[PDB]
Amino acid sequence: GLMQFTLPVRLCKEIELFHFDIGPFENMWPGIFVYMVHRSCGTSCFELEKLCRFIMSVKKNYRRVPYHNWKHAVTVAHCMYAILQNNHTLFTDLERKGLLIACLCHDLDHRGFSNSYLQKFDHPLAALYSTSTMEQHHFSQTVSILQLEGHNIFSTLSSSEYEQVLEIIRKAIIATDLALYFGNRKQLEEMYQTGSLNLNNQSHRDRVIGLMMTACDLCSVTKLWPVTKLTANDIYAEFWAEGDEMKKLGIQPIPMMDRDKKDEVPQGQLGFYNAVAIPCYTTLTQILPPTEPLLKACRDNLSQWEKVIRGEE
Ligand SMILES: CCN(C)C(=O)c1cnn(C)c1C(=O)Nc1ccn2cc(-c3cccc(OCCF)c3)nc2n1
Ligand SMILES: [Mg+2]
Ligand SMILES: [Zn+2]
Numbered sequence: 643g644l645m646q647f648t649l650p651v652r653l654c655k656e657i658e659l660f661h662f663d664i665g666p667f668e669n670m671w672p673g674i675f676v677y678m679v680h681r682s683c684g685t686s687c688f689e690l691e692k693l694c695r696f697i698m699s700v701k702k703n704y705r706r707v708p709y710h711n712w713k714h715a716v717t718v719a720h721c722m723y724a725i726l727q728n729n730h731t732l733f734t735d736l737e738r739k740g741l742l743i744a745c746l747c748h749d750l751d752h753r754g755f756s757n758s759y760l761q762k763f764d765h766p767l768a769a770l771y772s773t774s775t776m777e778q779h780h781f782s783q784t785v786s787i788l789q790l791e792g793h794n795i796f797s798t799l800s801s802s803e804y805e806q807v808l809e810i811i812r813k814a815i816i817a818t819d820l821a822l823y824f825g826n827r828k829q830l831e832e833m834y835q836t837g838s839l840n841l842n843n844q845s846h847r848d849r850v851i852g853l854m855m856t857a858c859d860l861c862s863v864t865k866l867w868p869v870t871k872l873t874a875n876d877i878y879a880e881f882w883a884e885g886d887e888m889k890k891l892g893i894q895p896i897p898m899m900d901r902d903k904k905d906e907v908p909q910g911q912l913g914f915y916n917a918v919a920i921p922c923y924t925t926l927t928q929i930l931p932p933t934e935p936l937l938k939a940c941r942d943n944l945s946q947w948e949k950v951i952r953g954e955e
Pocket of ligand 1: 859874877898899904905908
């Protein structure tokens with residue numbers, strides 16, 4: 643009951659900032675997560691024993707892939723933590739509980755391949771789940787782990803609170819399919835601009851949480867440049883392995899996944915900032931003004947990739 647987690651002084655201070663990097667010491671990441679649950683949600687939100695067992699089961703069900711790994715899970719969760727701590731009064735008790743768990747579970751059992759590669763491979767998950775293939779899988783693995791003996795961290799909720807929290811989690815994990823972000827952001831853009839955006843409208847909160855999930859998922863682009871640059875190496879190690887696997891199916895991969903086109907990475911990152919990242923953080927900042935440091939870090943990183951093209955680095 644009175645067992646708090648504490649962090650060294652540097653981490654206690656820097657964990658509050660959007661641009662925090664969780665560091666290379668894997669054994670500290672469960673503790674960093676519990677710390678965030680406890681400040682975000684409260685020391686009563688979960689039974690510590692059930693939570694520690696849930697976290698360790700989630701970790702075991704992420705694979706040893708270059709980018710879509712346990713570190714990505716804890717990083718995305720930390721960006722959610724910073725969003726929620728900077729918008730105290732805007733979110734319900736169930737929403738703070740649900741979203742930190744959703745972010746931790748959002749890529750469970752990722753293999754390092756896109757929805758597109760699963761469909762071209764004709765993988766069994768593509769017949770089970772014809773759209774948002776990996777995301778429906780991630781949600782499935784989340785419910786499986788929640789149903790393991792001693793792992794139901796939501797057990798103290800009523801039946802309706804429990805259906806509510808699992809529904810928040812399901813929508814938040816599905817929203818991490820980037821294919822769905824384009825239209826979600828366009829709708830929020832129109833709603834903010836015609837002044838019809840209403841946080842008391844459930845369909846509207848759902849869209850805002852979806853954008854939050856995209857913002858947290860893509861938060862590599864919001865770190866200090868040395869972090870963003872080194873994470874891009876892990877991002878491309880996965881993409882280039884998928885490209886190689888496309889060539890094995892007798893399919894030319896898109897340039898993003900062709901290692902033979904490594905030279906054009908700096909121009910490809912610019913397109914992504916301009917088409918996905920900058921628009922994402924701009925709309926989030928319009929709806930939730932205290933998330934502005936994410937937009938400001940993203941712009942700094944865009945300007946660093948423009949410097950790479952000019953051969954200043
Ligand atoms: C954290 C997100 N992040 C940083 C990401 O990259 C990220 C995370 N998830 N996803 C899906 C992305 C993403 O879509 N990234 C892209 C998009 C388009 N690209 C094109 C290229 C590219 C690369 C080399 C040569 C080239 O030549 C084009 C001319 F032939 C183009 N590289 C891209 N990278
Ligand atoms: Mg994903
Ligand atoms: Zn992810």
